[PDB]
Enzyme design. Structure first.
Site, PDB file in Angstrom:
ATOM      1  N   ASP A 159       0.815  -1.203   0.000  1.00  9.14           N
ATOM      2  CA  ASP A 159       0.000   0.000   0.000  1.00  9.14           C
ATOM      3  C   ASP A 159       0.856   1.264   0.000  1.00  9.14           C
ATOM      4  OD1 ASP A 159      -1.918   1.947   0.351  1.00  9.14           O
ATOM      5  OD2 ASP A 159      -2.534   1.265   2.344  1.00  9.14           O
ATOM      6  N   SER A 197      -0.519  15.743 -11.953  1.00  9.13           N
ATOM      7  CA  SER A 197      -0.819  15.389 -13.327  1.00  9.13           C
ATOM      8  C   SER A 197      -1.032  16.661 -14.135  1.00  9.13           C
ATOM      9  CB  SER A 197      -2.058  14.477 -13.391  1.00  9.13           C
ATOM     10  OG  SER A 197      -2.473  14.260 -14.731  1.00  9.13           O
TER      11      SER A 197
END
Length: 330
Positions: free
Chosen positions: A35, A199
């Site tokens: 994770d 992004s």
């Protein structure tokens, strides 16, 4: 040193991935959820309330000659998916894919949320976010990756998740046969303890690319892709019959639909998520309404590049002093 381990979807939807990990001496092999959105290594154990165990493989420190109680240390957890757990802490030898760490903090569950009890295939979590999010008290502990860095050939690990198929986590090297073209590296902020990046935009299907900054985290522990409501609305507007359902808790669409791809920007490069990656199947057995793999982050408070996005790429988690993230097509 290096390590290399295969990671396997737990079910036919890729809801999560499990990776075998060796703990203790002699080895006890547990299947852990790697994770990159948390920073604790915790396991079901011989100490977990018996009623809260149902199918999991447990860690038994008393059968390990290298296990030692970390006296006084406790942990307590709860992430962004409605779950929790707590207990005490041991140190022990932990190996992933041939890579061995001695003195790794192994957090032993005395109690687990029913959400874990319910999922027999996950024996625990191996956190790969930054150690500043580690929950051990009063002495905070390091992640497996942080402990490994000293001995790794290069202070990196890579995630190569499969679509309805096994994939690979590598430690200490970049497998140049595992991706196509170049790896595009992008800046990371560790200010929240996450692999947080920005992004450069998105496109829906064959549509034009929209340049726009989207701050989010690379989180292998989250199944889906969570993006701003504007972005998510623009995606699902291109699917006939798609709608946001409060009863279901997100966007659903007719199972008869063909989904468009979704492209996200990494600097000047582009990663394309095929439409089929965004299909998470009927909301209930027999239903003709299907659950969508792109959902709104509104109310989460952070955008999450989860497995839906990450499995479309070869991803480098560069833990150099100035950390960065790399993405390649594959």
């Amino acid at each position: 040193s290096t390590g290399s381990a295969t990671t396997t979807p737990i079910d036919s939807l890729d809801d999560a991935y499990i990776t075998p990990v060796q703990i203790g001496t002699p080895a006890q092999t547990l299947n852990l959820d790697f994770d990159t959105g948390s920073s604790d290594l915790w396991v079901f154990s011989s100490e977990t309330t018996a009623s809260e165990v149902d199918g999991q493989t447990i860690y038994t420190p008393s059968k390990s000659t290298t296990a030692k109680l970390l006296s006084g240390a406790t942990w307590s957890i709860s992430y962004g998916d409605g779950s929790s757990s707590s207990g005490d802490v041991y140190t022990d030898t932990v190996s992933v894919g041939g890579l061995t760490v001695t003195g790794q903090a192994v957090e032993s569950a005395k109690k687990v949320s029913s959400s874990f009890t319910e999922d027999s295939t996950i024996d625990g979590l191996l956190g790969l976010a930054f150690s500043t999010l580690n929950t051990v008290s009063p002495t905070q502990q390091k992640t497996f990756f942080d402990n490994a860095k000293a001995s790794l050939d290069s202070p990196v690990f890579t995630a190569d998740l499969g679509y309805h198929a096994p994939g690979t986590y590598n430690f200490g090297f970049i497998d140049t046969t595992a991706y196509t073209g170049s790896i595009t590296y992008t800046a990371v902020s560790t200010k929240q303890g996450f692999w947080e990046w920005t992004s450069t935009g998105y496109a829906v299907g064959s549509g034009t690319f929209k340049s726009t900054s989207i701050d989010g985290i690379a989180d292998t522990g989250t199944t889906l892709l969570y993006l701003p409501a504007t972005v998510v609305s623009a995606y699902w507007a291109q699917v006939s019959g798609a709608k946001s359902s409060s009863s279901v808790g997100g966007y659903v669409f007719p199972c008869s639909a063909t989904l468009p791809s979704f492209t996200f920007g990494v600097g000047s490069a582009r990663i394309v998520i095929p439409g089929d990656y965004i299909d998470f199947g009927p909301i209930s057995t027999g239903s003709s309404s299907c659950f969508g793999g792109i959902q709104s982050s509104a109310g989460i408070g952070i955008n999450i590049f989860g497995d839906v996005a990450l499995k479309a790429a070869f991803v480098v988690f560069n833990g150099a002093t100035t950390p960065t993230l790399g993405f390649a097509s594959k």
